[PDB]
Amino acid sequence: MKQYLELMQKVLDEGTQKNDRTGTGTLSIFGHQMRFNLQDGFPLVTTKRCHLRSIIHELLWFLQGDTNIAYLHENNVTIWDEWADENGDLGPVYGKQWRAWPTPDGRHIDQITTVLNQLKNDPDSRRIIVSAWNVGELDKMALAPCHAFFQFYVADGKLSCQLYQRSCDVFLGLPFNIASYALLVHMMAQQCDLEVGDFVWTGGDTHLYSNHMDQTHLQLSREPRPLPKLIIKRKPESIFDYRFEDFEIEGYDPHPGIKAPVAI
Amino acid sequence: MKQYLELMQKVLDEGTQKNDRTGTGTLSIFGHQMRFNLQDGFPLVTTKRCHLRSIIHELLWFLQGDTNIAYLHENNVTIWDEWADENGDLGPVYGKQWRAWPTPDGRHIDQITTVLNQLKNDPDSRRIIVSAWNVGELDKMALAPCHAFFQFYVADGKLSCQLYQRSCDVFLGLPFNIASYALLVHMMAQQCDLEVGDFVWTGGDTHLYSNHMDQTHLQLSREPRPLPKLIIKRKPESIFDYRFEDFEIEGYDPHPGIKAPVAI
Numbered sequence: 019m020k021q022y023l024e025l026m027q028k029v030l031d032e033g034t035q036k037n038d039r040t041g042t043g044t045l046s047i048f049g050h051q052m053r054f055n056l057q058d059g060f061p062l063v064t065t066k067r068c069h070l071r072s073i074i075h076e077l078l079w080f081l082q083g084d085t086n087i088a089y090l091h092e093n094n095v096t097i098w099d100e101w102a103d104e105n106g107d108l109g110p111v112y113g114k115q116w117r118a119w120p121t122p123d124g125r126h127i128d129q130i131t132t133v134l135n136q137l138k139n140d141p142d143s144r145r146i147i148v149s150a151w152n153v154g155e156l157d158k159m160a161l162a163p164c165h166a167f168f169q170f171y172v173a174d175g176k177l178s179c180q181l182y183q184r185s186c187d188v189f190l191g192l193p194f195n196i197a198s199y200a201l202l203v204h205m206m207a208q209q210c211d212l213e214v215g216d217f218v219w220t221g222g223d224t225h226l227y228s229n230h231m232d233q234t235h236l237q238l239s240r241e242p243r244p245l246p247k248l249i250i251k252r253k254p255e256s257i258f259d260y261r262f263e264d265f266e267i268e269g270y271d272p273h274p275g276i277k278a279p280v281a282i
Numbered sequence: 283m284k285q286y287l288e289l290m291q292k293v294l295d296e297g298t299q300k301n302d303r304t305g306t307g308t309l310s311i312f313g314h315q316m317r318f319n320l321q322d323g324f325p326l327v328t329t330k331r332c333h334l335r336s337i338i339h340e341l342l343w344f345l346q347g348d349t350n351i352a353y354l355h356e357n358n359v360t361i362w363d364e365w366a367d368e369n370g371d372l373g374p375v376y377g378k379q380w381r382a383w384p385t386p387d388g389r390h391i392d393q394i395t396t397v398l399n400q401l402k403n404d405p406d407s408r409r410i411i412v413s414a415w416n417v418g419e420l421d422k423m424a425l426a427p428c429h430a431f432f433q434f435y436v437a438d439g440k441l442s443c444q445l446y447q448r449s450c451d452v453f454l455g456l457p458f459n460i461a462s463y464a465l466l467v468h469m470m471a472q473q474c475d476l477e478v479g480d481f482v483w484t485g486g487d488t489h490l491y492s493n494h495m496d497q498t499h500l501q502l503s504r505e506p507r508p509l510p511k512l513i514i515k516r517k518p519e520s521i522f523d524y525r526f527e528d529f530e531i532e533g534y535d536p537h538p539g540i541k542a543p544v545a546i
């Protein structure tokens with residue numbers, strides 16, 4: 019997409035060679051924002067083929083409040099393999115925080131149910147947020163949430179959502195998250211009888227790993243193709259009842275996929 | 283400031299009429315980001331006279347981990363009176379969440395010290411964040427946090443900061459928060475022997491209350507003056523040992539102040 023590619027070029031031209039946790043090295047910029055009008059099409063990268071099966075199953079895995087990769091495996095998704103323990107657990111990551119944020123007094127908070135109820139009863143609320151940044155549980159998580167916090171908004175019957183991504187792997191992780199949240203907005207809109215609006219991406223440490231330089235240069239040479247469209251074949255009783263079979267991405271003509279090594 | 287005035291005009295030009303909790307009515311836009319290079323000067327609004335006293339004392343109050351207005355009153359700061367209970371208490375807001383975020387296992391985390399440790403021992407970390415958005419304590423708070431989350435970043439010996447403000451009252455609150463955060467960055471940098479970089483502001487529901495329109499346009503008819511300069515007359519042993527009297531704002535020649543009704 020034009021926005022995605024311009025961010026890449028931005029990282030190349032302005033990035034600061036930074037040493038990273040993995041000891042790999044990354045070109046990095048701090049602070050960036052982009053807007054994606056969902057009414058223009060699904061923001062799935064066209065300059066490289068993206069794998070939707072992983073994107074869809076991971077999201078349904080989140081909404082279930084699951085933190086064990088068993089479900090992912092059952093559906094051939096291996097993205098979380100390198101971080102799960104001997105038993106497949108990842109600690110209280112996203113899923114747990116979205117559906118069961120633990121209070122100090124022992125209670126748990128369902129942030130998705132709360133959001134649904136706010137969108138339906140109080141759409142003008144400026145407090146429609148879901149946060150995965152639970153400071154008290156960070157040390158138990160296999161990894162600290164990269165897509166840490168997000169906020170919904172309703173204006174003129176349209177549903178918007180801003181995502182704050184503290185750490186962003188521009189090449190691999192980014193295309194995945196854009197598509198993931200764009201999908202959530204669609205599922206939320208359908209459930210709350212609202213039209214889809216803007217999906218705004220905001221990041222902190224936006225970086226490109228040194229061992230992805232070639233792949234980047236390659237992708238940067240491809241002319242972006244028109245954006246596909248999403249079809250939701252069925253309307254479930256709740257945002258928690260969607261199935262992989264319910265989605266379809268029409269008009270998706272991407273350039274060949276580009277393979278790149280994963281940084282653990 | 284150029285960036286500030288530009289946001290105001292954006293809100294006016296692309297805003298959407300939206301009702302709000304206070305029952306006042308607002309003009310709102312969702313998603314914005316602006317950058318301030320702290321090297322250029324202290325980011326304090328010059329198109330209207332601002333009251334540094336209230337800003338500085340609030341920050342020191344915050345860092346103390348205090349959440350009772352008694353301190354503020356001793357120094358004639360009344361900016362938090364409308365929300366305090368009979369005993370002057372506001373609940374576990376800012377100060378508390380920063381100095382002692384409660385965990386589910388009976389621990390408490392001092393996010394300020396943690397961040398200081400990272401800035402000195404692991405400045406390349408992508409996890410240097412302080413969150414006030416404690417989902418499990420919101421009901422105890424007098425008001426849900428506006429400036430809910432912030433991230434620090436280091437590069438070329440310069441410290442930068444990005445803040446995510448979920449709800450922003452452009453006319454009243456914004457000028458306070460920007461001056462407040464720039465102050466924090468200067469304090470952090472001095473404690474970590476770093477120079478000041480950029481303050482990146484990101485807002486969710488960015489709005490102007492309908493009863494501030496005239497005051498807004500009055501302010502917009504004004505030419506911003508040169509940015510003041512901040513002089514810190516001492517290097518305390520710790521970030522929590524700063525006093526009001528250590529800060530000097532020099533060259534601050536603002537246009538007349540404009541009064542405007544608060545929305546409780």
Ligand SMILES: C#CCN(Cc1ccc2[nH]c(N)nc(=O)c2c1)c1ccc(C(=O)N[C@@H](CCC(=O)O)C(=O)O)cc1
Pocket residue numbers: 068069072096097098161162163164165185190191192194195276280
């Ligand atoms: C981000 C994220 C989610 N995930 C996993 C995952 C890994 C690290 C994380 N790190 C942090 N901090 N938070 C996360 O949510 C997170 C999630 C991803 C995993 C792999 C690829 C990847 O290798 N990309 C291939 C996948 C191909 C396939 O699955 O068939 C690609 O080319 O798209 C991308 C994203």
Ligand SMILES: C#CCN(Cc1ccc2[nH]c(N)nc(=O)c2c1)c1ccc(C(=O)N[C@@H](CCC(=O)O)C(=O)O)cc1
Pocket residue numbers: 333336361362425426427428429454455456458459540541542544
């Ligand atoms: C942000 C913030 C802190 N605050 C208060 C305050 C109020 C509501 C909030 N709401 C939420 N949710 N979070 C907050 O941080 C927050 C803070 C402010 C309060 C009042 C003025 C105000 O009345 N402005 C006068 C100041 C006069 C003076 O102090 O001398 C003016 O005319 O400018 C400014 C800032």
